[PDB]
Amino acid sequence: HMEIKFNIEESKILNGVYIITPNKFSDLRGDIWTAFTDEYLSNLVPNGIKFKHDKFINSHFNVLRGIHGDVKTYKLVTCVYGEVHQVVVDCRKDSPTYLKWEKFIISPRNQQLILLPPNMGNSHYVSSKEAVYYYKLAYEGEYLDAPDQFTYAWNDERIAIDWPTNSPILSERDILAM
Amino acid sequence: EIKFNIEESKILNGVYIITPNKFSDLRGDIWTAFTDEYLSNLVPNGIKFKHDKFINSHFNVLRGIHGDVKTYKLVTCVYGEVHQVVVDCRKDSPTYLKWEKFIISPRNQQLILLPPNMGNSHYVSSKEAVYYYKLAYEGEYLDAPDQFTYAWNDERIAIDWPTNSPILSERDILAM
Ligand SMILES: Nc1nc2c(ncn2[C@@H]2O[C@H](COP(=O)(O)OP(=O)(O)O)[C@@H](O)[C@H]2O)c(=O)[nH]1
Ligand SMILES: Nc1nc2c(ncn2[C@@H]2O[C@H](COP(=O)(O)OP(=O)(O)O)[C@@H](O)[C@H]2O)c(=O)[nH]1
Ligand SMILES: [Cl-]
Ligand SMILES: [Cl-]
Numbered sequence: 001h002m003e004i005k006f007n008i009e010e011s012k013i014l015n016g017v018y019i020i021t022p023n024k025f026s027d028l029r030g031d032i033w034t035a036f037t038d039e040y041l042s043n044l045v046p047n048g049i050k051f052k053h054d055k056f057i058n059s060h061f062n063v064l065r066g067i068h069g070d071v072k073t074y075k076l077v078t079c080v081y082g083e084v085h086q087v088v089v090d091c092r093k094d095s096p097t098y099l100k101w102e103k104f105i106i107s108p109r110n111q112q113l114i115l116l117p118p119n120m121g122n123s124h125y126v127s128s129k130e131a132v133y134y135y136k137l138a139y140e141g142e143y144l145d146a147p148d149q150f151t152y153a154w155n156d157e158r159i160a161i162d163w164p165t166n167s168p169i170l171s172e173r174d175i176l177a178m
Numbered sequence: 179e180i181k182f183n184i185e186e187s188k189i190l191n192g193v194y195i196i197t198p199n200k201f202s203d204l205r206g207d208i209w210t211a212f213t214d215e216y217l218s219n220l221v222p223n224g225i226k227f228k229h230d231k232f233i234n235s236h237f238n239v240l241r242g243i244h245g246d247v248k249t250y251k252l253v254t255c256v257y258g259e260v261h262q263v264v265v266d267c268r269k270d271s272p273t274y275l276k277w278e279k280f281i282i283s284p285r286n287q288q289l290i291l292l293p294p295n296m297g298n299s300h301y302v303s304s305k306e307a308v309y310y311y312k313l314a315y316e317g318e319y320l321d322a323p324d325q326f327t328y329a330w331n332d333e334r335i336a337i338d339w340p341t342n343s344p345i346l347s348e349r350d351i352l353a354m
Contacts, residue, residue: 002321004319028345029236029239029241029345030233030235030236030239030306031233031234032232032233032234034229034230034231035230035231035232036230038226039228050214052214052215053212053213053214054210054230054312055210056207056208056209056211056256056310057206057208058206058256059205060206063205065205080232080234080257080308080310081256081257108234130206132257132308134232134256134310136230143180143213169205171203
């Protein structure tokens, strides 16, 4: 309610993936909450990698963005309006859980932030009319844009993600990967 | 490429208006609210944006006017629409108790840089709003006990608000 808190839990199935739950102050006006402080959450990235980049992704119902990643970028991801099927893919070839995945259904009603290490596939599906997706990026030097990221097809038969659609709205990048 | 326009207010010195661009397509929009690279020259050496908050409010909620002695704030509305009102609460400023309104929404995605000792307020004109707020400060977070409050309808300030009957916290009522 009053003092800022975070519950932090490692994924039981994907090493290095973390589920962060903030508390909220709630009254008749709505809610206040802290998505991030340096003091509480800077330790979940290795020495002198700093979250230094904040992005919003506004998406319509049935949009699916993914599956995207790169070797530089730690991501802290949540949904601050509406609802998403957030799916993290293990893309580490050395990992026992290579090309396995974990889904989190994230909304203000279940306000979780997911921490992905680098070399992980990031994706989400918008299950609400509209969604606002918030994420913090931690990386050294220059942002890795689309041409330098990898792409796996949302419906890659090796990964076999459970999505609640057969007909998602996709970018040409995310269609090409099919 | 990630673009930010940085413009100083024509009304309140030290208040900056930051305008991002967006990638817009059939899916919606992708935009960057903040990078250390582009926006850290807006606060002094040694002082970092290190704290990210969200305020979810219903239609006709007014929160404000709030400030403190040390916090730099970068504020915007990422969903719905707010009348964002910055009040100059610096007594040594020539524009003490002047104000500037920004009607912020996804269709006008300005982020407002407030220095310390400024009045921060917003009114929700949409059914719901998501207010996003980055804080830059040295040391420990200043909570409500260590904040000043000016009344939303203080006649010395005379803010143009869309209503005479907003929904207010006990704190923002006391200030009246
Ligand atoms: N859990 C949590 N509570 C908060 C946070 N920020 C403020 N509060 C609490 O919510 C109440 C209202 O704070 P205030 O700054 O007066 O709220 P405002 O009217 O939205 O500006 C106080 O009890 C605060 O301690 C936060 O980030 N997390
Ligand atoms: N202006 C701007 N463009 C961006 C941003 N992030 C991505 N883009 C562009 O948006 C398009 C889609 O990017 P991508 O990373 O493929 O989007 P996703 O499929 O939603 O993850 C590309 O042309 C990118 O260069 C941003 O923060 N700002
Ligand atoms: Cl991503
Ligand atoms: Cl404030």
